Amino acid sequence: TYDLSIISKYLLIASYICSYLEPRYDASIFSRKNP
């Protein structure tokens, strides 16, 4: 269980999102309006 803090924990959890994701799809599926 890793030492890093809470905002850094969400900083890691957003970085794993672009593993299999590309810029062609992400802005559509995460709108405010296997690899």
Added chain:
Amino acid sequence: ADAQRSHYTVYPEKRWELYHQLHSHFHDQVDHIIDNIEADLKAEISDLLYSETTQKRRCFNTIFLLGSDSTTKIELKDESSRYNVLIELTPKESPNVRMMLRRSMYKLYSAADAEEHDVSYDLSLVENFKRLFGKDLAMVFNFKDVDSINFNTLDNFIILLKSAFKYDHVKISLIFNINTNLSNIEKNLRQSTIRLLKRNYHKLDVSSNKGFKYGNQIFQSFLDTVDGKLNLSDRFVEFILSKMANNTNHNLQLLTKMLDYSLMSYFFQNAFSVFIDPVNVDFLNDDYLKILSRCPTFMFFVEGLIKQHAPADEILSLLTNKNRGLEEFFVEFLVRENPINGHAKFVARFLEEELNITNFNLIELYHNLLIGKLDSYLDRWSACKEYKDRLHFEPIDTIFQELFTLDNRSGLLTQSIFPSYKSNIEDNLLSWEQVLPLSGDLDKIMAPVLGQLFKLYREANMTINIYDFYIAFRETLPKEEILNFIRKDPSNTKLLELAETPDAFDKVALILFMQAIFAFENMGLIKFQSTKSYDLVEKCVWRG
């Protein structure tokens, strides 16, 4: 004139003294705690480095210092008739197998001659060290930042050290200062070398934050240094709960920073700071007597006075109608010790050894004290259930404490220490009116140079065309002002020939546009994608 040459040198309080007697006295408590963990870390490596007599005696002893900050210094024993040397290898000095060997042999060799009172810098010295320097050798390897190194270089390095195990006059010891994540390290190496590593391993933890044995300690020594002369408000301390939780590695250096800066705020603006010693009652003035009046607990108690005593002739007399009794009304409540400090020190040592509990944070313990949540604080162990009545304290609504307190009621040290960086820049460029108040009449009818494109810079696409952005930029500039501006000066001559040109407005726009977008590259707001084409750029800065 000279600014293009780099690094040219040149050779061109009644209140504050009461700070000076408080600040250093606090800092004697700081650094004495700092050498305690410094003596702690230096001790627990030293005994564990020795006395480990394994039976095979053909293996190096390794030590994993988990959670360590890559800066942990080590001292060594003298241990006569044998030299004991320290080698450090920074990932900056880890390019290959080759220079990791060659610099490291160099670093001990000068350390060998300095104690000794031409040769080749490789393992040739290691066997002949008995003959080259007399006494035997016990080297130690302070691998500073171990996870940045390409591990196959490290794996090929340790096999090179494995060949030195057949001379019997040399002893090897490895120190692995990881940052974290021991499970990551057994993934990266070759498994044939982990079985070489696993002979006598020791997973000693070294962390500044380990069960808050020093975090709760340094806040405690803060409290007695400011005991009885001040308070710590609720909104202040939750900031110390929240923000210090965002930095795992070094709380202790951070808690020194945000507390001492908070104390610097109090001495610099509060006039009643002089009155924390009662000897300074002779410095009293009507200006001091006037500013005491706007205290919130002062006026609220007067509202408490009128409703309790509906006769208000006494209360009106002790108001500014008198001044001698008025300050005597103040110095009645002057010496309030506020035993929440002492009640904290009462309960801190208790659960430390009576129930013997260590996983606790004294700051939120002080914070739950400030609301009355001490009962809902001790619940998380269910061990003070026999003691919740004797460790009980209801926080009383104390009076006149708002003059001796610390709180981020202004958002100061929120701003000046943790600044909303790209927020404050972007707020500076959309608004610009709350930063800036012949030719200034133009300024009241025309925006400053950097900010006037920024409103359209928001209103532009992801990747934008340069010229149409200028075409949009030329819309925001009205024509009559510029020819009023370019013909303002009759003294200069070289400008005036440009001023009479009929295409001056469209030329002076591209000059001014190529001074602003020229100046949006050192800020990194706009990136010039695909150089030598530069027809389109990319904007990375978004509002959030």
Added chain:
Amino acid sequence: SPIPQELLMKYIHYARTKIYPKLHQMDMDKVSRVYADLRRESISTGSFPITVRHLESILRIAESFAKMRLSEFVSSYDLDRAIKVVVDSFVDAQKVSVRRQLRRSFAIY
């Protein structure tokens, strides 16, 4: 533990052919307040809107629950189950990106 099948199917025909529960304007205007929040929050975060047909639907679901409760009129908390039925159908009929609406409807849940 549950209601038997024969009594349930006889209760369906008994309640559907005898009662007609209406609504009284005493405190029903509060649902027009909460619809006023719930419509607006579907524009800013969501893409699909909420219309007057959803208001007609929750009044029908509340009077259907009052019909099943066999009362004289619709109660005040039948609309709570009606708004729960419309939230877990409309919010569940969208993407995962309306996830903030899962907690935005938690204040009336």
Added chain:
Amino acid sequence: SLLVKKYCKMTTEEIIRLCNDFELPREVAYKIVDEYNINASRLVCPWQLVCGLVLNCTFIVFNERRRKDPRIDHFIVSKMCSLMLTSKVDDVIECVKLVKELIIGEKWFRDLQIRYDDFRYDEIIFRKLGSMLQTTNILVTDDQYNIWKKRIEMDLA
């Protein structure tokens, strides 16, 4: 719930009805028509935008009374919550926070702040600057305290 009954036009006679009750001067009263005419083209919902602009200017034109009386700040919004017949005060504040950043990239508000000389200015140039001598609002300020004092002590005697 008139604010959620969207897609209706507020004509030139209609909008000046909406600002003469809130006491707007002629400078902004034509400007509201001027910027609705800007935003009649690219709109999405006409009810939300027309009220979000009228609150923040009344926040900035009446701040010589708003900073000197905190009670009238609920008075100006609730008299519109009765005029627009809103649900509560939850949704109306959600509008005024929304369109404020939507008008921060325009021209006239950067004039209307510095024309009205209203703001306070020397606080913001000392708050954003990070001044140690800035006001800490653990206190009540001397003017509002004297407003509190002269109201209470004359109520007293």
